[PDB]
Amino acid sequence: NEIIFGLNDGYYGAPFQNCVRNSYDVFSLLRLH
Amino acid sequence: LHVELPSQQRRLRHLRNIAA
Amino acid sequence: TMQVSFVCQRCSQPLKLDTSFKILDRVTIQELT
Ligand SMILES: [Zn+2]
């Protein structure tokens, strides 16, 4: 009697430096909101 | 493939599947 | 190595924050909240 869910990245069940980028600045976030 | 660090929003909008 | 604490929800890449976020003035908190 179990249910298994599925999200974007995979399936969830019941509990029994070189790659970093730049984040948006506060001004752009305010503009987006 | 789920990076387990926090701040990863996990809401109903990201959920598309169900099974028993 | 570089320690990161956020990841882009759509871009799927680790992010580097801006100093203004750590120095958020109360105006931005009031507006965004
Ligand atoms: Zn992105």
What is the residue-wise DSSP string for C3-31?
----B-TTT-SBEE--HHHHT--HHHHHH
Question: Which residues are CB-contacts of A22 (< 8 A; sequence separation ≥ 6)?
Answer: C15, C16
Contact B15, A6 (CB under 8 A): yes
Contact C20, A18 (CB under 8 A): no
Token pair belonging to B5: 């660090």
Resolution of this model in Å is 3.4
Token pair belonging to C20: 């203004």
Q: Ion ligand 1 — residues with CB under 5 Å? A: C 8, 11
State the DSSP code for B5. Answer: S
Contact B14, A8 (CB under 8 A): yes
The minimum CA-CA distance between B1 and chain A, rounded to whole Å, is 6
Cα(A24)–Cα(B5) distance, integer angstroms: 20
Q: Which residue from B minimizes the CA distance to C4?
A: B5
